[PDB]
Amino acid sequence: RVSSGRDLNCVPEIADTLGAVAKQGFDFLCMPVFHPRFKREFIQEPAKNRPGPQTRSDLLLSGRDWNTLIVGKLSPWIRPDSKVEKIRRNSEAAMLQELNFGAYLGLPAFLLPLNQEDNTNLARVLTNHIHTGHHSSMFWMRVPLVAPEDLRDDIIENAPTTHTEEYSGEEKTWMWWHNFRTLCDYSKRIAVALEIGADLPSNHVIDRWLGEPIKAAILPTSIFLTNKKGFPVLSKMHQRLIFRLLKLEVQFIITGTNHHSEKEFCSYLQYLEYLSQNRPPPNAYELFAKGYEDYLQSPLQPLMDNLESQTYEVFEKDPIKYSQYQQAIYKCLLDRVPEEEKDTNVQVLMVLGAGRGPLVNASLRAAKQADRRIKLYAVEKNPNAVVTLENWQFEEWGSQVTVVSSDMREWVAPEKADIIVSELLGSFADNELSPECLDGAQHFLKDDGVSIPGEYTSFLAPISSSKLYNEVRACREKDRDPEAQFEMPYVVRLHNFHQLSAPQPCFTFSHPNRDPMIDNNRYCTLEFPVEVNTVLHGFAGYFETVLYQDITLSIRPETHSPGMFSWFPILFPIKQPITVREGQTICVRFWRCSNSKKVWYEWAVTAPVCSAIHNPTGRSYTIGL
Amino acid sequence: RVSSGRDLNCVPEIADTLGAVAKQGFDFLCMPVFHPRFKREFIQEPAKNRPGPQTRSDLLLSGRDWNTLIVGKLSPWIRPDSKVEKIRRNSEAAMLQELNFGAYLGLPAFLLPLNQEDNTNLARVLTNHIHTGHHSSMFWMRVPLVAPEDLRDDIIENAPTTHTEEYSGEEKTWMWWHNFRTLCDYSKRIAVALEIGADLPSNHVIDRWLGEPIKAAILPTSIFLTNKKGFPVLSKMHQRLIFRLLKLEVQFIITGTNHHSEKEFCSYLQYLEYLSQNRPPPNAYELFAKGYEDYLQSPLQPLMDNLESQTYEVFEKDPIKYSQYQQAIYKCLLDRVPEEEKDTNVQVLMVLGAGRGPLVNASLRAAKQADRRIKLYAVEKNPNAVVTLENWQFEEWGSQVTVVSSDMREWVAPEKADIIVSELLGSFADNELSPECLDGAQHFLKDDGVSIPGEYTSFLAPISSSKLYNEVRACREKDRDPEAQFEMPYVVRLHNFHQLSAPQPCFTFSHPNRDPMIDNNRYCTLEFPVEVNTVLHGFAGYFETVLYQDITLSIRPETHSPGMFSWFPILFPIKQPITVREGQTICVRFWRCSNSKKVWYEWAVTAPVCSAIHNPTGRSYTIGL
Ligand SMILES: Nc1nc2cc(CN3C(=O)c4cc(F)ccc4[C@]34CCN(Cc3ccc(F)cc3)C4=O)[nH]c2cc1F
Ligand SMILES: Nc1nc2cc(CN3C(=O)c4cc(F)ccc4[C@]34CCN(Cc3ccc(F)cc3)C4=O)[nH]c2cc1F
Ligand SMILES: CSC[C@H]1O[C@@H](n2cnc3c(N)ncnc32)[C@H](O)[C@@H]1O
Ligand SMILES: CSC[C@H]1O[C@@H](n2cnc3c(N)ncnc32)[C@H](O)[C@@H]1O
Known part of the structure; x- marks a missing residue:
């Protein structure tokens, strides 16, 4: 052994x-x-x-x-x-x-x-x-x-x-x-x-x-x-x-x-x-x-890219996540539809980003255990996945599910939704541009409509790992900036590392967003009290999400959903390691930036010493709209 | 199957x-x-x-x-x-x-x-x-x-x-x-x-x-x-x-x-x-x-580099080569020493580049089958190999073999040699700088002394291989010229290729060299009659060597020594493929160049169209002296 x-x-x-x-x-x-x-x-x-x-x-x-x-x-x-x-x-x-x-x-x-x-x-x-x-x-x-x-x-x-x-x-x-x-x-x-x-x-x-x-x-x-x-x-x-x-x-x-x-x-x-x-x-x-x-x-971008079959397969091989989605919808149906309006009220559900249809299924299970009537749409932009949906829909689902092959930001809805269900969250929550997509799909939600998830937050924690630093270093490629590899996040199972401080919340998003002139740009300052001598090499990223109420998913170590394995942590490196004495505070700054075409993060350490601002103007890393 | x-x-x-x-x-x-x-x-x-x-x-x-x-x-x-x-x-x-x-x-x-x-x-x-x-x-x-x-x-x-x-x-x-x-x-x-x-x-x-x-x-x-x-x-x-x-x-x-x-x-x-x-x-x-x-x-450079143990191992796992060396020395002993001077004359042999001592052994076998007396030196610069020699010498050989740990160009000999034996040949013969080494070791040869090998020649043949061209292409590395990979030879078992013309001799060397002011710089023009339409991608290199007289080694396909597998062919690529019609002649030019520190090849195609001169001043490839 x-x-x-x-x-x-x-x-x-x-x-x-x-x-x-x-x-x-x-x-x-x-x-x-x-x-x-x-x-x-x-x-x-x-x-x-x-x-x-x-x-x-x-x-x-x-x-x-x-x-x-x-x-x-x-x-x-x-x-x-x-x-x-x-x-x-x-x-x-x-x-x-x-x-x-x-x-x-x-x-x-x-x-x-x-x-x-x-x-x-x-x-x-x-x-x-x-x-x-x-x-x-x-x-x-x-x-x-x-x-x-x-x-x-x-x-x-x-x-x-x-x-x-x-x-x-x-x-x-x-x-x-x-x-x-x-x-x-x-x-x-x-x-x-x-x-x-x-x-x-x-x-x-x-x-x-x-x-x-x-x-x-x-x-x-x-x-x-x-x-x-x-x-x-x-x-x-x-x-x-x-x-x-x-x-x-x-x-x-x-x-x-x-x-x-x-x-x-x-x-x-x-x-x-x-x-x-x-x-x-x-x-x-x-x-x-x-x-x-x-x-x-590299972090997945299912908006910019069309995910492969086996990428959807491994998503579906996480039964804990969908059971939570099933339970989330189950409760929301009971709250929105009383017992006396069981067979009068048909709720309009809209799975935004249906993939190969795990949520469609979950929505069907949720409606059956609740014993309530639903009308499903299945919006999906990836046309390769839509082939899976339509074959399922013909064979299994039927006319209750209406498969739509479109972007949710574009799609002109023939009906407003009581619930919208989405699965647009990455390892840093908003790194798949869930904010932008759900903002653009917000218009066809009822004025009293629900979003699942209704909220999600990203967390950050400073880490010391001479291994991971040396790993990033070795991602230098021809025909680009020599230090581009340091200015981009990575999805990684963090193993040989040291978490220097407790995770703190970075960016939060609420759906439906009711703030006039909705802005998804952000700027967050975090101070991490360090109690040991060490050398900072990057920042581990996690996230939490509230599906409905007490129904949640999380990859934050202290509140991690047990059994779930659908998101590894994300890693924001820094160009140069930073020595940190015991008693000193690590101060990091994180921006969420955007233009009409792209969304990206920038970040900088400001204490105990300053780093350079990483990924300015998304030069090294962008997320495609 | x-x-x-x-x-x-x-x-x-x-x-x-x-x-x-x-x-x-x-x-x-x-x-x-x-x-x-x-x-x-x-x-x-x-x-x-x-x-x-x-x-x-x-x-x-x-x-x-x-x-x-x-x-x-x-x-x-x-x-x-x-x-x-x-x-x-x-x-x-x-x-x-x-x-x-x-x-x-x-x-x-x-x-x-x-x-x-x-x-x-x-x-x-x-x-x-x-x-x-x-x-x-x-x-x-x-x-x-x-x-x-x-x-x-x-x-x-x-x-x-x-x-x-x-x-x-x-x-x-x-x-x-x-x-x-x-x-x-x-x-x-x-x-x-x-x-x-x-x-x-x-x-x-x-x-x-x-x-x-x-x-x-x-x-x-x-x-x-x-x-x-x-x-x-x-x-x-x-x-x-x-x-x-x-x-x-x-x-x-x-x-x-x-x-x-x-x-x-x-x-x-x-x-x-x-x-x-x-x-x-x-x-x-x-x-x-x-x-x-x-x-x-990459072609081995045993002068510039010190070869590993397992590199010497695979050399030694070629019994045909050493049997030819054994036979070569065997005959030379009989020619130099008559029957009446069997136990009067002891021949001074000097293995120049003894490695782990396959030649020393072969020289011992050759002397025994000939029944003639010999005195062996074993000059070797690689100090790691000298450890092998001395352990063998102590246990097996004895005082007949005198292990010398030196460069042959430097070594001050206490005695002149009747025979010098060397194994300093690569896939293009002179690509390991056998000319320079044996020229520098020439002074301690007797005026009537023999060199084994006494001669070697390199051959070239034009080849069409869209595979190999695409292989070289993919050897582009960071932090050097984008086309450096095309201006350097490779040792390769040529498989998926087409030989467009019959091999022709390129460079020849004779030892001992008796030409005043010995120059190992060369310039060779070759014309290859092509009888088919094709696209030239490079030039396959081979070599022949005369050990003594009728004792030879060769990797030239038509005169290839049967069973031997101690040298794969060498490949000189070109930056751009060159189309060749049936009836047209491929004209290549090859230089052997040197300064006090380095030796290198340059080459150019001049017909049917001109290529750029490859590896000017050994910018992309040099052989270390
Ligand atoms: N919309 C969605 N986005 C997302 C975004 C994610 C996370 N993610 C990547 O970003 C990513 C990037 C990659 F190059 C490779 C893999 C991933 C994953 C997906 C699976 N996986 C866990 C895992 C992998 C392998 C394993 F043997 C065990 C577990 C990740 O870390 N999972 C989603 C699920 C959704 F429904
Ligand atoms: N002084 C000597 N130089 C030389 C120079 C050579 C040729 N050579 C390389 O240059 C070279 C460069 C490499 F990166 C790797 C290998 C080689 C060889 C040595 C062995 N081999 C054949 C082979 C390899 C593998 C195999 F499964 C079967 C056969 C080559 O092609 N053999 C010598 C033997 C001497 F005594
Ligand atoms: C099940 S993983 C999330 C799914 O949402 C889909 N998706 C992402 N962005 C959009 C969008 N704007 N409109 C429709 N589907 C989307 C992706 O193609 C993927 O199948
Ligand atoms: C057996 S392969 C050839 C051997 O010759 C040795 N050699 C090469 N050049 C010299 C030199 N100039 N003097 C001595 N040994 C040499 C190499 O180290 C290798 O072991």
């Missing part, structure tokens, strides 16, 4: 080592490429002219074994940021040599340590190696939760351990990582191998690593407790951490000697398996979502 | 039709999306306001069935290039409607006919559809080998069939295709469905379709002969054509009614299977090559 490997810093025979490791159930082996103690000179004679082979032959394993089962390790003596000029220069040449040999073997990953603050020259050498030739080899940066200096035993007489609560000081290992990856300019080849300590730090220190590219989680043998049976286990603190790490789907590495000598070394791995099996299973949401983790997709 | 489908222009029940087709062993079904006879008006009333559904519902099949098993067909009444303005306008609207519905269903392919010369407005509408939205749906252009007018029965009294040999006139259906795809600007979505006739045309007419994107081969039932048993078969003419088509791996479509009424419809398909099984099986070359058909790869 769980993908696990073994860290060793001693390999006397490479073939024999693997065999043992593989027999214990490990998937891969982290090991040195040159002997850890084999220190090499590159400048001063005569040690530079040392004869003989420098390491093992590549022939000792097959090409496939190198490619899948081995993870390289930088030798410990290599210190590129040494104060001594000689050791620096030597460590440079040695680092390149080891990294080059790693690429020669075609290793999938290679471990480098972050065990101090200044890793500038380390970063400069690695970056150079990345920009030499072509390779897909990952680089896992070995970085501890807690720095070695901060978890040392208080046993030095004239140098006691810091007994002071230093909020910023306990987050230092993240700052080590942050600076390194910034210098390297957010390379997608550079990821984190997070080393877990005996004493876990405060909760904030761990939350720091949310939204970071964690590929490995190194577990020492020392941190394992022993149970009554006499086999390795972990604390309830560590258990909760491993449970969190299993959601990220990281690869767990075991390092250190067998402290549980009486038992096998498989026991450690068997415990991780034990934890893997013993987790809360994936719900309908996470079942379906499994696959689209942090996958950027 | 063979991928086959069924063409129908009559589908009364879509579900039942598939069942029958699937039971007969067909993989997919070509069918209409709207009823062939269902002609629709879009302008004039009242026919434009025709009620009811326009076609079948998408719900009759599953999404997956549409995506894999159905191929769309444009209705026959749709004529976008009609002389009548009304029929034109109507056919435009209808064409878009059908194409849009095809995309709605998510069909993998869609058939459009090329049954006349002028298909300009057809091309204009299709191109518009391609540039509307995003889809991966292919478009198969139905084009006959022989035009309907040219295969009609000579049964009209006052209009007899052309009994004249019109060389250009019999190639007209290709010109139909050529013009169409040119208008559409070589879209990768547009391919050919070649319709085979009863009487096959002349051989030249068929050769015209070499290097064209043929995805389907439509076979009417009428063209099938009947055997003594009373089941469908094909002529020896058609058999050879199908054998050629099986190499291209096209999908065979069966069209028309069952003329063999007594037998099943599976019999037709079973015959294609019968042919599929009964072909000459793939040799060692085609066995290994299967996968890299028309796959563009």
Whole structure:
């Protein structure tokens, strides 16, 4: 179930080592490429002219074994940021040599340590190696939760351990990582191998690593407790951490000697398996979502574009949404039509944007459970979908449903509606121009008519995700602005991220709109109180909608409709990441803009520092009218 | 084995039709999306306001069935290039409607006919559809080998069939295709469905379709002969054509009614299977090559770059090459050392570019079968490979082999060589700068010393491939010249192409070079007599090398070393395709250029029309010294 490997810093025979490791159930082996103690000179004679082979032959394993089962390790003596000029220069040449040999073997990953603050020259050498030739080899940066200096035993007489609560000081290992990856300019080849300590730090220190590219989680043998049976286990603190790490789907590495000598070394791995099996299973949401983790997709525009058959199919495969629509209409029928006017009053319903007709069906079910008479129209502009409607209408529905093949803004209605039902909402509610469409369809609603939905609101929340930022970055395309990708929203299942503040309402719309000279342009200022140090990369967008009264749909995490999976969150990126100290307020500004042809959003951060205004004049992103 | 489908222009029940087709062993079904006879008006009333559904519902099949098993067909009444303005306008609207519905269903392919010369407005509408939205749906252009007018029965009294040999006139259906795809600007979505006739045309007419994107081969039932048993078969003419088509791996479509009424419809398909099984099986070359058909790869530069382990591995997995090297050295030892000086004379061999040491081994085998004494050096600049050499040398070889870790141009030799052995040849021979390296290593050769190889030559041949041209086109990258991809050679297994003329020698090099002030710059004019109409897209490059005397290696098709698969051909593209009439000479000019840092090629076509000079000053492509 769980993908696990073994860290060793001693390999006397490479073939024999693997065999043992593989027999214990490990998937891969982290090991040195040159002997850890084999220190090499590159400048001063005569040690530079040392004869003989420098390491093992590549022939000792097959090409496939190198490619899948081995993870390289930088030798410990290599210190590129040494104060001594000689050791620096030597460590440079040695680092390149080891990294080059790693690429020669075609290793999938290679471990480098972050065990101090200044890793500038380390970063400069690695970056150079990345920009030499072509390779897909990952680089896992070995970085501890807690720095070695901060978890040392208080046993030095004239140098006691810091007994002071230093909020910023306990987050230092993240700052080590942050600076390194910034210098390297957010390379997608550079990821984190997070080393877990005996004493876990405060909760904030761990939350720091949310939204970071964690590929490995190194577990020492020392941190394992022993149970009554006499086999390795972990604390309830560590258990909760491993449970969190299993959601990220990281690869767990075991390092250190067998402290549980009486038992096998498989026991450690068997415990991780034990934890893997013993987790809360994936719900309908996470079942379906499994696959689209942090996958950027362009927001659908069913007005500008005509949706495909299989796009409508996946909409229809959400029974919770339509049951809510069914219930919404059901109640509205009872309110508008009394019991004494059951078979006198026929309500005029108008599904605006009928698609392949899930609402038409729902409206039929709603009328039957209510036991009230209805007259249905099914307005749909997409002519490909209208083919589906008419075939259904001929076979199943009949003359009760009148299929109209038109835009709702254009259509001249032969009758006014008591209810209009729509499904024109995207992940940011109004991103499919539901306001404009329903405004244009408003004239053929009765003066006392109802709209379903009657209201919808969009929400925003600041997020830190070095993953998603790096994902957007990689959406640069030929023949357009170099930074166009940052000035456009994405539909994405947000997974590896950190929500820095609680969602707040952005834009609200009410139908039918009764405000004279109806304007759908907006400008919203939001202030998000941050309680942690972090780096803002964008703003996650959600929405809520009121169908009728107490009938609602929502993708806002705290009020999320259970089971529903018809809308993933939306992501508004920013060009440049913005550092945010604990106590500081993130201030974002959002505009909804329009002309006769297009609608778009612009946005800007104004605190703690200013960003550029994103998507001015909809240059990078527009929504078609 | 063979991928086959069924063409129908009559589908009364879509579900039942598939069942029958699937039971007969067909993989997919070509069918209409709207009823062939269902002609629709879009302008004039009242026919434009025709009620009811326009076609079948998408719900009759599953999404997956549409995506894999159905191929769309444009209705026959749709004529976008009609002389009548009304029929034109109507056919435009209808064409878009059908194409849009095809995309709605998510069909993998869609058939459009090329049954006349002028298909300009057809091309204009299709191109518009391609540039509307995003889809991966292919478009198969139905084009006959022989035009309907040219295969009609000579049964009209006052209009007899052309009994004249019109060389250009019999190639007209290709010109139909050529013009169409040119208008559409070589879209990768547009391919050919070649319709085979009863009487096959002349051989030249068929050769015209070499290097064209043929995805389907439509076979009417009428063209099938009947055997003594009373089941469908094909002529020896058609058999050879199908054998050629099986190499291209096209999908065979069966069209028309069952003329063999007594037998099943599976019999037709079973015959294609019968042919599929009964072909000459793939040799060692085609066995290994299967996968890299028309796959563009960048030429290796083992001087500038350090080759990976698995790059050396695949070199070593060619036993024919080294057996030739073994035999080459074997003979040279016997010539240089007589029988009476068997154990007096030790020959000094020097493998220049030893890699992981296949030649060192071969030199050992060659000396043993010859029974002569040798002293080996193993010069290698790549330090990663030197690790392999030294481990081998320690374990196996010993002090007979002296591993040197240096550039051969730099290395100060402590002894002069009787033989130097090298493996510095690429697909265009001198594209790895074997001339420069061996010139720089020439000083430590004895005055009577031998070089293996002693000579090598590069060859060029003009090719027509609309596939490969379109492949290169798609190698456009951000942040460089828009046409850089055309000014650089590619290593590629040439498959779907047409060789327009016989290869001719381009550049030759002899080692040891004894010409004062050795210049490796060159300028070569070649004239290629073409005997067919075609469109030049590039120049395939090959090479021959003389190891010693009668010991040679070659990838030139006519003199190709049997079994060897260590070099695929190289491809020099051109920016713009060049039309070439039968009888015309293709004149190409090739330069080998250099400065102190780089070596590169430039090239230009000078007849029948001039091209631009490609890669001036090595702007787009250089080979590193
Ligand atoms: N009018 C409507 N608009 C909308 C707008 C949406 C959201 N949406 C996109 O914008 C979008 C853009 C894309 F490129 C791809 C997919 C989407 C979705 C639709 C489905 N889906 C969830 C999902 C996808 C995959 C999955 F394995 C599980 C769940 C989204 O995120 N759903 C509507 C339903 C309506 F009726
Ligand atoms: N010094 C040498 N140079 C050379 C130069 C070559 C040719 N070459 C490339 O340039 C090249 C460039 C690439 F991106 C990828 C591959 C190649 C090859 C090497 C192997 N191969 C054949 C093949 C590949 C794959 C296959 F499934 C079957 C056969 C080529 O075409 N082979 C040498 C061997 C030497 F000893
Ligand atoms: C069921 S998803 C929403 C549906 O509304 C349709 N739609 C969107 N805008 C309009 C409009 N202005 N008039 C009619 N249908 C519309 C879309 O084509 C889609 O089928
Ligand atoms: C076996 S493929 C050719 C080999 O020659 C080596 N080589 C290429 N140019 C030189 C050079 N100038 N000096 C030494 N080895 C070389 C390459 O590193 C490769 O291993």
